[PDB]
């Protein structure tokens with residue numbers, strides 16, 4: 001792809017994080033802690049899942065960023081509306097304000113409703129995410145496989161400002177402790 005020149009510097013918003021997440025000093029990495037991280041509760045925190053938002057809000061233009069997922073067994077990545085539900089149970093779908101892909105149990109899927117199987121020959125270690133606000137497009141790229149296309153959501157109805165979206169996943173297995181990292185430009 002040729003989206004690299006739309007690169008944006010994303011940082012994580014601590015205030016939105018589930019209370020078990022640990023965000024690095026530079027706000028560029030996030031991982032699952034083994035306990036509550038001793039923060040107060042607030043209406044912005046995702047309560048039920050190990051999720052966090054980027055601080056940046058997008059309402060126009062073209063934006064691109066990359067995320068490192070090396071050695072993880074489970075994660076969700078993409079964008080979401082600023083006004084998505086934070087508390088309780090919900091599914092990741094465009095109807096609920098999410099445009100996402102994930103890894104779960106050795107398969108990759110797009111967060112449509114119902115979910116769509118992805119066809120990935122080279123398991124990615126870094127994911128590229130492209131948003132074209134005006135066109136209503138969210139695309140995902142396999143950086144490990146020379147930028148090959150993973151998935152495109154088109155005809156998106158964003159219906160609000162967008163924020164970068166992250167889920168580090170649970171670590172019931174002991175094999176999913178590794179962080180998500182925002183990769184340098």
Ligand SMILES: c1cc(NC[C@H]2CCCO2)ccn1
Nearest residue numbers: 018019020047048049050170
């Ligand atoms: C199972 C459930 C846990 N709940 C506390 C936090 C983590 C994400 C959702 O809320 C923590 C660890 N194992």
